[PDB]
């Protein structure tokens, strides 16, 4: 509250550390469905159904241009990528499996780096 603060957690390295994680996700072999924005002219249903499209290249551009105010807003956009994937893709498909694998990979790196 006013003039009552918990001790200052060091956040000076968060930007660098989120960038490293994002690099690791970009280079994973199962990243291919997520590297670029879904082409809304060429994929029927996507535009109407997925209210907030997100992909790794869009996260990279936001990160590089100071559009994440803190590490939680970064994790929210990564998780949105995988939540979108589950909304549009069956679990038993290559893309559906890719999303599960990438979410797992991310959540471990997130915990190991920050928690």
CSV table of N, CA and C in Angstrom, one decimal:
chain,number,residue,atom,x,y,z
A,1,UNK,N,0.9,-1.2,0.0
A,1,UNK,CA,0.0,0.0,0.0
A,1,UNK,C,0.9,1.2,0.0
A,2,UNK,N,0.3,2.4,0.2
A,2,UNK,CA,1.2,3.6,0.2
A,2,UNK,C,2.3,3.6,1.2
A,3,UNK,N,3.5,3.8,0.7
A,3,UNK,CA,4.7,3.8,1.6
A,3,UNK,C,4.9,2.4,2.3
A,4,UNK,N,4.4,1.3,1.7
A,4,UNK,CA,4.5,-0.1,2.2
A,4,UNK,C,4.8,-1.0,1.1
A,5,UNK,N,6.1,-1.3,0.9
A,5,UNK,CA,6.6,-2.1,-0.2
A,5,UNK,C,7.2,-3.4,0.2
A,6,UNK,N,6.9,-4.5,-0.4
A,6,UNK,CA,7.7,-5.7,-0.3
A,6,UNK,C,9.1,-5.4,-0.8
A,7,UNK,N,10.1,-6.2,-0.4
A,7,UNK,CA,11.4,-6.1,-0.9
A,7,UNK,C,11.6,-6.1,-2.5
A,8,UNK,N,12.4,-5.3,-3.0
A,8,UNK,CA,12.6,-5.1,-4.5
A,8,UNK,C,13.2,-6.4,-5.1
A,9,UNK,N,12.4,-7.3,-5.7
A,9,UNK,CA,12.9,-8.4,-6.7
A,9,UNK,C,13.7,-7.8,-7.9
A,10,UNK,N,14.9,-8.3,-8.2
A,10,UNK,CA,15.7,-7.8,-9.2
A,10,UNK,C,15.1,-8.2,-10.6
A,11,UNK,N,14.6,-7.2,-11.3
A,11,UNK,CA,14.0,-7.4,-12.7
A,11,UNK,C,14.9,-6.9,-13.8
A,12,UNK,N,16.1,-6.5,-13.6
A,12,UNK,CA,17.0,-5.8,-14.6
A,12,UNK,C,17.5,-6.7,-15.8
A,13,UNK,N,17.5,-8.0,-15.5
A,13,UNK,CA,17.8,-9.1,-16.5
A,13,UNK,C,16.6,-9.8,-17.2
A,14,UNK,N,15.4,-9.3,-16.8
A,14,UNK,CA,14.2,-10.1,-17.3
A,14,UNK,C,14.1,-10.0,-18.9
A,15,UNK,N,14.4,-8.8,-19.4
A,15,UNK,CA,14.4,-8.6,-20.9
A,15,UNK,C,15.3,-9.5,-21.6
A,16,UNK,N,16.5,-9.7,-21.1
A,16,UNK,CA,17.5,-10.6,-21.7
A,16,UNK,C,17.1,-12.0,-21.5
A,17,UNK,N,16.6,-12.4,-20.4
A,17,UNK,CA,16.2,-13.7,-20.1
A,17,UNK,C,14.9,-14.2,-21.0
A,18,UNK,N,13.9,-13.3,-21.0
A,18,UNK,CA,12.8,-13.6,-21.9
A,18,UNK,C,13.2,-13.8,-23.4
A,19,UNK,N,14.2,-13.0,-23.8
A,19,UNK,CA,14.7,-13.1,-25.2
A,19,UNK,C,15.4,-14.5,-25.4
A,20,UNK,N,16.2,-15.0,-24.4
A,20,UNK,CA,16.8,-16.3,-24.5
A,20,UNK,C,15.8,-17.4,-24.5
A,21,UNK,N,14.7,-17.3,-23.7
A,21,UNK,CA,13.7,-18.3,-23.8
A,21,UNK,C,13.0,-18.3,-25.2
A,22,UNK,N,12.7,-17.2,-25.7
A,22,UNK,CA,12.0,-17.0,-27.0
A,22,UNK,C,12.9,-17.6,-28.1
A,23,UNK,N,14.2,-17.3,-28.0
A,23,UNK,CA,15.2,-18.0,-28.9
A,23,UNK,C,15.1,-19.5,-28.9
A,24,UNK,N,15.1,-20.1,-27.7
A,24,UNK,CA,15.0,-21.5,-27.5
A,24,UNK,C,13.7,-22.0,-28.1
A,25,UNK,N,12.6,-21.3,-28.0
A,25,UNK,CA,11.3,-21.7,-28.5
A,25,UNK,C,11.3,-21.6,-30.1
A,26,UNK,N,11.9,-20.5,-30.6
A,26,UNK,CA,12.1,-20.3,-32.0
A,26,UNK,C,12.9,-21.4,-32.7
A,27,UNK,N,13.8,-22.0,-32.0
A,27,UNK,CA,14.7,-23.0,-32.6
A,27,UNK,C,14.3,-24.4,-32.3
A,28,UNK,N,13.2,-24.7,-31.6
A,28,UNK,CA,12.7,-26.0,-31.3
A,28,UNK,C,12.2,-26.6,-32.6
A,29,UNK,N,12.4,-27.9,-32.9
A,29,UNK,CA,11.9,-28.5,-34.1
A,29,UNK,C,10.4,-28.5,-34.3
A,30,UNK,N,9.6,-28.4,-33.2
A,30,UNK,CA,8.2,-28.4,-33.3
A,30,UNK,C,7.6,-26.9,-33.3
A,31,UNK,N,8.4,-25.9,-33.5
A,31,UNK,CA,8.0,-24.5,-33.5
A,31,UNK,C,7.3,-24.1,-34.8
A,32,UNK,N,7.5,-24.9,-35.9
A,32,UNK,CA,7.0,-24.5,-37.2
A,32,UNK,C,5.6,-24.0,-37.3
A,33,UNK,N,4.6,-24.5,-36.6
A,33,UNK,CA,3.2,-24.0,-36.7
A,33,UNK,C,3.1,-22.5,-36.2
A,34,UNK,N,4.1,-22.1,-35.4
A,34,UNK,CA,4.0,-20.9,-34.5
A,34,UNK,C,4.9,-19.8,-34.9
A,35,UNK,N,5.8,-20.0,-35.9
A,35,UNK,CA,6.8,-19.0,-36.2
A,35,UNK,C,6.3,-17.7,-36.8
A,36,UNK,N,5.3,-17.8,-37.5
A,36,UNK,CA,4.7,-16.7,-38.2
A,36,UNK,C,3.2,-16.6,-38.0
A,37,UNK,N,2.6,-15.4,-38.2
A,37,UNK,CA,1.2,-15.3,-38.0
A,37,UNK,C,0.4,-16.1,-39.1
A,38,UNK,N,-0.6,-16.7,-38.6
A,38,UNK,CA,-1.5,-17.5,-39.4
A,38,UNK,C,-2.1,-16.6,-40.5
A,39,UNK,N,-2.1,-17.1,-41.7
A,39,UNK,CA,-2.5,-16.3,-42.9
A,39,UNK,C,-4.1,-16.3,-42.9
A,40,UNK,N,-4.6,-15.2,-42.5
A,40,UNK,CA,-6.0,-15.0,-42.3
A,40,UNK,C,-6.8,-15.0,-43.6
A,41,UNK,N,-6.2,-14.7,-44.7
A,41,UNK,CA,-6.8,-14.8,-46.0
A,41,UNK,C,-6.9,-16.3,-46.5
A,42,UNK,N,-5.9,-17.1,-46.0
A,42,UNK,CA,-5.8,-18.5,-46.5
A,42,UNK,C,-6.2,-19.6,-45.6
A,43,UNK,N,-6.6,-19.3,-44.4
A,43,UNK,CA,-7.1,-20.3,-43.5
A,43,UNK,C,-8.5,-20.0,-43.0
A,44,UNK,N,-9.5,-20.6,-43.7
A,44,UNK,CA,-10.9,-20.5,-43.3
A,44,UNK,C,-11.1,-20.7,-41.9
A,45,UNK,N,-12.0,-19.9,-41.3
A,45,UNK,CA,-12.4,-19.9,-39.9
A,45,UNK,C,-11.5,-19.2,-38.9
A,46,UNK,N,-10.3,-19.0,-39.3
A,46,UNK,CA,-9.3,-18.5,-38.2
A,46,UNK,C,-9.6,-17.2,-37.7
A,47,UNK,N,-9.9,-16.3,-38.7
A,47,UNK,CA,-10.1,-14.8,-38.4
A,47,UNK,C,-11.3,-14.7,-37.4
A,48,UNK,N,-12.4,-15.4,-37.7
A,48,UNK,CA,-13.6,-15.3,-36.9
A,48,UNK,C,-13.5,-16.0,-35.6
A,49,UNK,N,-12.9,-17.1,-35.6
A,49,UNK,CA,-12.8,-17.9,-34.4
A,49,UNK,C,-11.8,-17.5,-33.4
A,50,UNK,N,-10.6,-17.0,-33.8
A,50,UNK,CA,-9.5,-16.7,-32.9
A,50,UNK,C,-9.4,-15.3,-32.7
A,51,UNK,N,-9.9,-14.8,-31.6
A,51,UNK,CA,-10.1,-13.4,-31.4
A,51,UNK,C,-8.8,-12.6,-31.3
A,52,UNK,N,-7.7,-13.3,-30.7
A,52,UNK,CA,-6.4,-12.6,-30.6
A,52,UNK,C,-5.3,-13.5,-31.1
A,53,UNK,N,-5.0,-13.5,-32.3
A,53,UNK,CA,-3.9,-14.3,-32.9
A,53,UNK,C,-2.6,-13.9,-32.3
A,54,UNK,N,-1.7,-14.9,-32.1
A,54,UNK,CA,-0.4,-14.5,-31.6
A,54,UNK,C,0.5,-15.6,-32.2
A,55,UNK,N,1.8,-15.2,-32.4
A,55,UNK,CA,2.8,-16.1,-32.9
A,55,UNK,C,4.2,-15.6,-32.4
A,56,UNK,N,5.2,-16.5,-32.6
A,56,UNK,CA,6.5,-16.2,-32.1
A,56,UNK,C,7.2,-14.9,-32.7
A,57,UNK,N,7.0,-14.7,-34.0
A,57,UNK,CA,7.6,-13.5,-34.6
A,57,UNK,C,7.0,-12.2,-34.1
A,58,UNK,N,5.7,-12.2,-33.8
A,58,UNK,CA,4.9,-11.1,-33.3
A,58,UNK,C,5.4,-10.8,-31.8
A,59,UNK,N,5.6,-11.9,-31.0
A,59,UNK,CA,6.2,-11.8,-29.7
A,59,UNK,C,7.6,-11.1,-29.8
A,60,UNK,N,8.4,-11.6,-30.7
A,60,UNK,CA,9.8,-11.1,-30.9
A,60,UNK,C,9.8,-9.6,-31.2
A,61,UNK,N,8.9,-9.2,-32.1
A,61,UNK,CA,8.8,-7.8,-32.4
A,61,UNK,C,8.3,-6.9,-31.2
A,62,UNK,N,7.3,-7.4,-30.5
A,62,UNK,CA,6.8,-6.7,-29.3
A,62,UNK,C,8.0,-6.6,-28.2
A,63,UNK,N,8.7,-7.7,-28.0
A,63,UNK,CA,9.8,-7.8,-27.0
A,63,UNK,C,10.9,-6.7,-27.4
A,64,UNK,N,11.3,-6.8,-28.6
A,64,UNK,CA,12.4,-5.9,-29.2
A,64,UNK,C,12.0,-4.4,-29.2
A,65,UNK,N,10.7,-4.0,-29.0
A,65,UNK,CA,10.3,-2.6,-29.2
A,65,UNK,C,9.6,-2.1,-27.9
A,66,UNK,N,10.0,-2.8,-26.7
A,66,UNK,CA,9.4,-2.4,-25.4
A,66,UNK,C,8.0,-2.4,-25.2
A,67,UNK,N,7.3,-3.3,-25.9
A,67,UNK,CA,5.9,-3.4,-25.7
A,67,UNK,C,5.4,-4.4,-24.7
A,68,UNK,N,6.3,-5.1,-24.0
A,68,UNK,CA,5.9,-5.9,-22.8
A,68,UNK,C,6.3,-5.0,-21.5
A,69,UNK,N,5.3,-4.6,-20.7
A,69,UNK,CA,5.7,-3.9,-19.5
A,69,UNK,C,6.4,-4.7,-18.4
A,70,UNK,N,6.2,-6.1,-18.4
A,70,UNK,CA,6.9,-6.9,-17.4
A,70,UNK,C,6.9,-8.4,-17.9
A,71,UNK,N,7.6,-9.2,-17.2
A,71,UNK,CA,7.7,-10.6,-17.7
A,71,UNK,C,6.4,-11.4,-17.7
A,72,UNK,N,5.4,-11.0,-16.9
A,72,UNK,CA,4.1,-11.7,-16.9
A,72,UNK,C,3.3,-11.4,-18.2
A,73,UNK,N,3.4,-10.2,-18.8
A,73,UNK,CA,2.7,-9.9,-20.0
A,73,UNK,C,3.4,-10.7,-21.1
A,74,UNK,N,4.7,-11.0,-21.0
A,74,UNK,CA,5.4,-11.8,-22.0
A,74,UNK,C,4.9,-13.3,-22.0
A,75,UNK,N,4.8,-13.8,-20.8
A,75,UNK,CA,4.3,-15.2,-20.6
A,75,UNK,C,2.8,-15.3,-21.1
A,76,UNK,N,2.0,-14.3,-20.8
A,76,UNK,CA,0.6,-14.3,-21.3
A,76,UNK,C,0.5,-14.5,-22.8
A,77,UNK,N,1.3,-13.8,-23.6
A,77,UNK,CA,1.3,-13.9,-25.1
A,77,UNK,C,1.9,-15.3,-25.5
A,78,UNK,N,2.9,-15.8,-24.9
A,78,UNK,CA,3.4,-17.1,-25.2
A,78,UNK,C,2.2,-18.1,-25.0
A,79,UNK,N,1.6,-18.0,-23.8
A,79,UNK,CA,0.5,-19.0,-23.5
A,79,UNK,C,-0.7,-18.8,-24.5
A,80,UNK,N,-1.0,-17.6,-24.9
A,80,UNK,CA,-2.0,-17.4,-26.0
A,80,UNK,C,-1.7,-18.1,-27.3
A,81,UNK,N,-0.4,-18.2,-27.7
A,81,UNK,CA,-0.1,-19.0,-28.8
A,81,UNK,C,-0.6,-20.4,-28.7
A,82,UNK,N,-0.4,-21.0,-27.5
A,82,UNK,CA,-0.8,-22.4,-27.3
A,82,UNK,C,-2.2,-22.6,-27.0
A,83,UNK,N,-2.8,-21.7,-26.4
A,83,UNK,CA,-4.3,-21.7,-26.2
A,83,UNK,C,-5.0,-21.5,-27.5
A,84,UNK,N,-4.6,-20.6,-28.4
A,84,UNK,CA,-5.1,-20.6,-29.7
A,84,UNK,C,-5.0,-21.9,-30.5
A,85,UNK,N,-3.8,-22.5,-30.4
A,85,UNK,CA,-3.6,-23.8,-31.1
A,85,UNK,C,-4.6,-24.8,-30.6
A,86,UNK,N,-4.8,-24.9,-29.3
A,86,UNK,CA,-5.8,-25.9,-28.8
A,86,UNK,C,-7.2,-25.6,-29.3
A,87,UNK,N,-7.6,-24.3,-29.3
A,87,UNK,CA,-8.9,-23.9,-29.8
A,87,UNK,C,-9.2,-24.4,-31.3
A,88,UNK,N,-8.2,-24.4,-32.1
A,88,UNK,CA,-8.3,-24.6,-33.5
A,88,UNK,C,-7.9,-26.0,-34.0
A,89,UNK,N,-7.2,-26.7,-33.2
A,89,UNK,CA,-6.6,-28.0,-33.7
A,89,UNK,C,-7.0,-29.2,-32.8
A,90,UNK,N,-7.3,-30.3,-33.4
A,90,UNK,CA,-7.5,-31.5,-32.7
A,90,UNK,C,-6.2,-31.8,-31.9
A,91,UNK,N,-6.3,-32.4,-30.7
A,91,UNK,CA,-5.2,-33.0,-30.0
A,91,UNK,C,-4.4,-34.0,-30.8
A,92,UNK,N,-5.2,-34.9,-31.5
A,92,UNK,CA,-4.6,-35.9,-32.3
A,92,UNK,C,-4.3,-35.4,-33.8
A,93,UNK,N,-3.5,-34.4,-33.9
A,93,UNK,CA,-3.0,-33.9,-35.2
A,93,UNK,C,-1.5,-33.5,-35.0
A,94,UNK,N,-0.8,-33.3,-36.0
A,94,UNK,CA,0.6,-32.9,-35.9
A,94,UNK,C,0.7,-31.5,-35.2
A,95,UNK,N,-0.2,-30.6,-35.6
A,95,UNK,CA,-0.1,-29.3,-35.0
A,95,UNK,C,-0.6,-29.3,-33.5
A,96,UNK,N,-1.7,-30.1,-33.3
A,96,UNK,CA,-2.2,-30.2,-31.9
A,96,UNK,C,-1.1,-30.7,-31.0
A,97,UNK,N,-0.3,-31.7,-31.5
A,97,UNK,CA,0.8,-32.3,-30.6
A,97,UNK,C,1.9,-31.3,-30.4
A,98,UNK,N,2.3,-30.6,-31.5
A,98,UNK,CA,3.2,-29.6,-31.5
A,98,UNK,C,2.9,-28.6,-30.4
A,99,UNK,N,1.7,-28.1,-30.3
A,99,UNK,CA,1.3,-27.1,-29.3
A,99,UNK,C,1.5,-27.6,-27.9
A,100,UNK,N,1.0,-28.9,-27.7
A,100,UNK,CA,1.3,-29.4,-26.4
A,100,UNK,C,2.7,-29.5,-26.0
A,101,UNK,N,3.6,-30.0,-26.9
A,101,UNK,CA,5.0,-30.1,-26.7
A,101,UNK,C,5.7,-28.8,-26.4
A,102,UNK,N,5.3,-27.8,-27.2
A,102,UNK,CA,5.9,-26.5,-27.0
A,102,UNK,C,5.4,-25.8,-25.7
A,103,UNK,N,4.2,-26.0,-25.3
A,103,UNK,CA,3.7,-25.4,-24.0
A,103,UNK,C,4.5,-26.0,-22.8
A,104,UNK,N,4.6,-27.4,-22.9
A,104,UNK,CA,5.5,-28.1,-21.9
A,104,UNK,C,6.9,-27.6,-21.8
A,105,UNK,N,7.6,-27.4,-23.0
A,105,UNK,CA,8.9,-26.9,-23.1
A,105,UNK,C,9.0,-25.5,-22.5
A,106,UNK,N,8.0,-24.7,-22.9
A,106,UNK,CA,8.0,-23.3,-22.3
A,106,UNK,C,7.9,-23.3,-20.8
A,107,UNK,N,7.0,-24.0,-20.2
A,107,UNK,CA,6.6,-23.9,-18.8
A,107,UNK,C,7.8,-24.4,-18.0
A,108,UNK,N,8.5,-25.3,-18.4
A,108,UNK,CA,9.7,-25.7,-17.7
A,108,UNK,C,10.8,-24.7,-17.7
A,109,UNK,N,11.1,-24.1,-18.9
A,109,UNK,CA,12.1,-23.1,-19.0
A,109,UNK,C,11.7,-21.9,-18.1
A,110,UNK,N,10.4,-21.6,-18.1
A,110,UNK,CA,9.8,-20.4,-17.4
A,110,UNK,C,10.1,-20.6,-15.8
A,111,UNK,N,9.7,-21.8,-15.3
A,111,UNK,CA,10.0,-22.2,-13.9
A,111,UNK,C,11.5,-22.2,-13.6
A,112,UNK,N,12.3,-22.8,-14.4
A,112,UNK,CA,13.7,-22.9,-14.2
A,112,UNK,C,14.5,-21.6,-14.2
A,113,UNK,N,14.0,-20.6,-15.0
A,113,UNK,CA,14.6,-19.3,-15.1
A,113,UNK,C,14.2,-18.3,-14.0
A,114,UNK,N,13.0,-18.4,-13.6
A,114,UNK,CA,12.3,-17.4,-12.7
A,114,UNK,C,11.8,-17.8,-11.4
A,115,UNK,N,11.4,-19.1,-11.2
A,115,UNK,CA,10.7,-19.6,-10.0
A,115,UNK,C,11.5,-20.5,-9.1
